[PDB]
């Protein structure tokens, strides 16, 4: 709602660099300053415009329809962009050129801004997803994204994360039809998933892979091409940790996201069908090896997330077994782990009081 103002004026947009919106506007040091000042003026104009926001009160009847959880139309926001795209360009203009350490910071800040906007506005979303003639901001992101990932620059750790939070929030706040505009993502998600990437990035890329997998023509963009296939990368990753910080909690977030992805894809309706089960078993044995010893009732939040993941994986595997009856064959390599876990996890879930006919039926099937 109106909270967009509070969000934009959040003192540190990112922890560190102490750069707010103010620290973006008040900078007399692509546009050539023939538009820096004009854009700053648009910025504070839109600040006022939203600080009014007569709209999102007494229900805002126009709020409703598609765009799941209709984002409150904050038209004033539409005026911020030319600034934001000026800076995203000075990042791009500074890129595409075979220092930037400073300019890139303003770009990160502006990306956080755009993130909040896409989060809480609908007119900006209609604009961007509209005109293929993509609103210059979309291209300013995409031509960066490759540079956001391909180059492991010290700051390429963050600009990527923010551009991804933006792309994903924009796929969420919007509707299903426009996603073919997002189509351009698939040329860049692979680099976004390279084992040189950290947990938070692959996470956002998974979330977005899902948000696109809701689209009819988009699911095959998962593994239309059997080779490379924008998968078996996700699985080689989930199995062989390509990150070192690798805070187990983060890896749990990622297992959970990958699981929800697999489930949505399976229910909505590659060579990759084969590796998925191997990776799921590696993951599961990675979980059951943790909680068992602790035993008892999990009072830990991590434990509860793990249990949710395990139950969902069990149901998913039952669906798998429903398919590809060779699943025992492809499982041959790890049947050891599979039968060293399945019985104990069945015991556990039976111990759980939230059991489901699905959980019981599956665990019995195996």
């Amino acid at each position: 709602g109106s909270i967009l103002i509070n969000l934009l004026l959040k003192q540190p947009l990112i922890p560190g660099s102490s750069l707010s919106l103010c620290h973006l506007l008040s900078s007399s040091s692509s546009f050539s300053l023939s538009a820096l000042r004009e854009a700053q003026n648009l910025a504070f104009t839109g600040l006022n415009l939203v600080a009014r926001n007569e709209c999102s009160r007494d229900g805002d009847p126009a709020e409703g329809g598609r765009r799941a959880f209709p984002l409150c139309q904050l038209p004033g926001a539409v005026h911020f962009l030319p600034l934001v795209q000026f800076f995203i360009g000075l990042h791009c203009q500074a890129l595409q050129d075979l220092s930037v350490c400073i300019l890139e910071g303003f770009s990160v800040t502006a990306l956080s801004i755009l993130q909040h906007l896409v989060c809480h506005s609908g007119a900006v979303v209609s604009l961007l997803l509209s005109g293929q003639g993509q609103h210059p901001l979309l291209k300013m992101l995409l031509h960066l994204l490759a540079f956001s990932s391909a180059a492991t620059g010290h700051l390429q750790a963050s600009v990527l994360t923010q551009c991804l939070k933006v792309l994903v929030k924009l796929a969420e706040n919007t509707s299903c039809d426009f996603l073919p505009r997002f189509q351009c993502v698939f040329q860049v998600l692979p680099k976004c998933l390279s084992p040189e990437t950290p947990l938070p990035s692959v996470l956002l890329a998974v979330e977005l892979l899902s948000l696109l997998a809701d689209h009819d023509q988009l699911a095959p963009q998962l593994c239309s091409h059997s080779e490379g296939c924008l998968l078996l990368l996700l699985y080689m990753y989930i199995t062989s940790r390509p990150d070192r910080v690798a805070l187990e909690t983060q890896w749990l977030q990622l297992e959970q996201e990958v699981v929800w992805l697999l489930a949505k894809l399976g229910v909505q309706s590659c060579q990759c069908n084969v590796e998925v089960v191997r990776a799921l078993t590696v993951m599961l044995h990675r979980q059951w090896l943790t909680v068992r010893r602790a035993g008892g009732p999990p009072r830990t939040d991590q434990q509860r997330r793990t249990v949710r993941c395990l139950r969902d994986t069990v149901l998913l595997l039952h669906g798998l077994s429903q398919k590809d009856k060779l699943f025992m064959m492809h499982c041959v390599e790890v049947l050891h782990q599979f039968d060293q876990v399945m019985p104990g996890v069945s015991m556990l879930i039976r111990g759980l009081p939230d059991v489901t006919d699905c959980e019981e039926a599956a665990l019995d099937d195996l």
């Binding site: 509070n6 003192q11 969420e172 899902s210 959970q256 929800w260 949710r308 039968d339 019985p343």
Partner: protein
């Protein structure tokens, strides 16, 4: 009905199964066609139940009746609609739950067999629910309702349509589908779907009866537990949440009966004590929330509200905002200082009027301690003695408030409500103690002043008299009070003992019950206070409460000095046979040290080892839990001290906060060299039949216990003891087995060296174990044993890792239950180079199996 053909789907192909079962579906609909065609068809008076029960049973048994093509789909949709029309009628309420189970478990079945169908069914259900909530809005929004409606989903052309004519209908159908959703959340949860669920939850919450609001609250709790909340949904949710909190005090009891549990669940799960849970939350929301918390508090809420529980949620939230949310996220610092200052002014203002003020303890202590740390720190800039009175306004306000209460009570018991006021003084003392102890970074060079010893003396005068003339009506609560007070006093004096007489005097009131009625001995003769307190003892002793009695006994056992020690020990023994198992637990948990003060720092009490040898297994549970440091008691003079023992990590319903200490050697805690001759008096607990909880508690104590006891000394008895121990692994209880597996690590960390005889008994007992296992074929035991061996190996150092590895490698040659696949990899904590280390023995592990060929 045609049971034979129903079962034998038979020749009915994957294409003709649909038609072969179309007739069964027709029969089932004929059933539903009449018994449930209309709502009031029968006086519900609640036989029809058998029909839904059959629906559920046949669902569980024969999936093909429903699924295996599109016909099957509209069939359910046709069925479901026949149910929704039932879920709207109040009189049908006693079925609506059976419908929450019929609709439920059916989406389940579809998930088990035909996921895609389940997904599409869920999508229709959600579009439905969305229409319903939008209708709710339009209704209370003040716009048109046109109660004659369709809610056209699950549309079945098979061949009544759906319609909700009164908010009875809408509310009922919504609550029912909402319970269904609370069940199927995970199966339905996805990325873009979560925002939809959030939207409909917020719709219900902003607009709906209080009941539906609580239902949706639990729903949203499960949601935040499954996937967290994004930004897009928050604002609405938080507006509703805060308006609700504000409306609380202006809410009814039954209404409270609704909002009570789920609201506390939501608040605890959305604002948990574990840190880094704030990063999920946009600050602006938290600042708004803290504002509304200050408002609710500043409005005299705590006295206005009823549910002591909900106040617990509020206090928990305040504790969160005090400690786990770092200043600089909620807002700048000064705003937080101001807020907490005001909320604490209030928290003070309340105490003298409540009977149970404990929930005020966590936050009050948290603020006192935060200020104490920041103060000793800023002044840590430059011993460094400090005073507290003039430092924090909250502190001295609390102080003079306790003073006002003590005094107004001092004027007359009648002019004062005794219980609330004794409680106020007692909580102020509890805080004085907790903070003077832990706040004092010297315990973590600065020292800090606190409440007054003359005041302590004043209250020690006041309490007995308040009891002495309480009219024998409210005495008991006053006994509980004085118990709590003395507990704080005693924790404090343990941290820093006081002048004797004050400590001497106290020992009377702690011994008060058992002085007069039956003592009549010489201990009271040489005792001073006894003659002074004879009359009050003959007035009170018979009134003391068993819980409070054991409390006082544990307290006296805590009473440390060369001060009336013979009498304390006397009463300790007396209560050792007290006929009250609570008192027996206190007796053990206090004698464990009261005796080391006595004399003979040699072995355990024969008296105890026998008394414990009797029943009341709880006594033996605590007996091992205390053995854990009774070992160190029979060691360097026990240097009593407390863990952090702060209130939140504990359940907060603390009886005798002093009941958190576990002592240590005064100094020079040399290798205990425990010959284990004492462990025999102890290990007898492990008869293989005692309640598994005690055995597990002892497995826990094993960690601390390992270092002290000696193992090389007296190989014979030590090895007998170790055998008694390894009697664990074949224990029938399971958690005990895995815990022993995990603590063999501590053991072999204590072991000096890997002698042969010890490896010999290892091999012997593990062969016995595997043999009892396969002779019994207890795969569970096999897993427990594999894990025990894996731990013993990952921890072992010498020739033993070879042995456990041989065992795991033999296990690798076995059936499904081969956990080795995990362990012999874990041992790496270089499979090829590691094989090279024992390639030669390794191959031997094969030869015997190769004797099979």
């Amino acid at each position: 009905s045609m049971i034979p053909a129903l079962r034998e789907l038979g020749s009915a192909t994957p294409e003709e199964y649909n038609t072969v079962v179309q007739k069964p579906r027709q029969i089932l609909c004929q059933f539903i066609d009449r018994i449930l065609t209309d709502v009031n068809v029968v006086a519900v008076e609640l036989t029809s139940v058998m029909l839904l029960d059959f629906i559920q049973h046949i669902m569980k048994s024969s999936p093909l009746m429903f699924v295996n093509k599109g016909s099957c789909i509209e069939f359910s949709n046709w069925i479901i609609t026949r149910l929704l029309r039932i879920a709207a009628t109040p009189s049908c309420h006693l079925l609506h739950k059976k419908i929450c189970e019929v609709i439920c478990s059916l989406l389940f079945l579809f998930k088990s067999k035909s996921p895609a169908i389940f997904g599409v069914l869920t999508k229709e259900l959600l579009q439905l629910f969305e229409d319903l909530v939008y209708l709710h809005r339009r209704n209370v929004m003040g716009h048109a309702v046109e109660w004659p409606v369709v809610m056209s989903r699950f549309l079945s052309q098979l061949d009544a349509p759906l319609q909700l004519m009164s908010m009875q209908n809408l509310e009922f159908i919504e609550v029912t589908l909402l319970m269904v959703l609370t069940r199927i959340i995970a199966i339905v949860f996805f990325r873009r779907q979560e925002l939809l669920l959030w939207q409909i939850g917020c719709v219900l919450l902003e607009y709906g009866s209080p009941k539906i609001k609580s239902l949706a609250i639990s729903f949203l709790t499960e949601l935040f537990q499954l996937g967290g909340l994004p930004a897009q949904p928050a604002s609405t949710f938080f507006s509703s949440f805060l308006e609700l909190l504000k409306h609380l005090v202006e809410m009814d009891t039954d209404q409270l009966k609704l909002y009570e549990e789920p609201l506390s669940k939501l608040i605890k799960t959305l604002f948990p004590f574990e840190a880094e849970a704030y990063r999920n939350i946009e600050p602006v929301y938290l600042n708004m929330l803290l504002e509304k918390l200050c408002v609710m508090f500043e409005d005299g809420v705590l006295m206005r509200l009823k549910s002591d529980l909900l106040k617990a949620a509020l206090c928990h939230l305040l504790q969160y905002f005090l400690k786990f949310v770092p200043a600089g996220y909620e807002s700048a610092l000064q705003v937080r200082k101001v807020y907490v200052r005001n909320i604490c002014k209030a928290l003070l203002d309340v105490l003298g009027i409540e009977v149970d003020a404990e929930y005020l303890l966590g936050p009050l202590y948290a603020a006192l301690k935060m200020e104490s740390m920041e103060i000793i720190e800023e002044i840590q800039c430059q011993i460094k003695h400090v005073d507290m009175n003039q430092k924090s306004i909250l502190w001295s306000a609390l102080k003079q408030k306790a003073e006002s209460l003590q005094i107004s009570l001092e004027y007359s018991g009648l002019k004062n409500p005794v219980i609330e006021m004794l409680e106020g003084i007692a909580v102020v003392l509890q805080l004085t103690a907790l903070c003077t102890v832990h706040c004092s970074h010297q315990n973590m060079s600065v020292v800090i002043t606190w409440m007054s010893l003359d005041f302590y003396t004043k209250v020690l005068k006041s309490c007995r008299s308040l009891l002495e003339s309480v009219q024998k009506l409210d005495l008991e609560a006053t006994i509980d009070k004085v118990v709590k007070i003395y507990d704080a006093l005693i924790y404090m004096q343990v941290n820093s003992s006081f002048e004797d007489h004050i400590l001497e005097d106290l020992c009377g009131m702690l011994s008060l019950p058992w002085i007069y009625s039956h003592s009549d001995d010489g201990c009271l003769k040489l005792t001073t206070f006894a003659a002074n307190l004879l009359t009050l003892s003959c007035r009170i002793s018979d009134s003391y409460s068993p819980q409070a009695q054991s409390r006082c006994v544990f307290l006296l056992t805590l009473f440390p000095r060369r001060i009336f020690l013979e009498w304390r020990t006397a009463v300790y023994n007396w209560a050792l046979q007290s006929s009250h198992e609570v008192i027996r637990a206190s007796c053990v948990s206090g004698f464990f040290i009261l005796l080391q003060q006595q004399n003979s720092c040699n072995r355990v009490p024969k008296i105890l080892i026998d008394k414990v040898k009797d029943d009341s297994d709880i006594v033996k549970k605590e007996f091992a839990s205390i053995l854990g440091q009774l070992v160190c008691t029979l060691h360097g003079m026990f240097y009593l001290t407390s863990s952090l023992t702060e209130p939140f990590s504990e359940h907060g319903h603390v009886d005798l906060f002093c009941r958190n200490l576990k002592a240590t050697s005064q100094h020079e805690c040399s290798s205990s060299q425990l010959k284990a001759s004492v462990c025999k008096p102890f290990l007898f607990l492990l008869k293989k039949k005692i309640p598994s909880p005690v055995k597990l508690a002892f497995i826990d104590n094993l960690h601390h216990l390992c270092k002290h006891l000696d193992f090389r000394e007296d190989e014979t008895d030590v090895k007998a003891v170790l055998g008694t121990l390894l009697n664990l692994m074949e224990d029938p209880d399971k958690d005990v087995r895995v815990a022993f597996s995990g603590n063999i690590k501590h053991i072999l960390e204590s072991l000096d060296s890997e002698d042969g005889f010890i490896k010999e008994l290892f091999v012997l007992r593990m062969k016995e174990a595997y043999t009892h296992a396969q002779i019994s074929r207890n795969n569970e035991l096999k897993d427990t044993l594999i894990l025990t061996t894996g731990d013993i190996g990952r921890a072992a150092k010498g020739d033993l890792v070879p042995f456990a590895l041989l065992h795991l490698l033999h296990c690798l040659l076995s059936k499904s239950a081969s956990v080795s696949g995990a362990a012999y990899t874990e041992i790496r904590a270089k499979l090829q180079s590691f094989f090279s280390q024992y390639k030669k023995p390794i191959c031997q592990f094969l030869v015997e199996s190769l004797h099979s060929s």
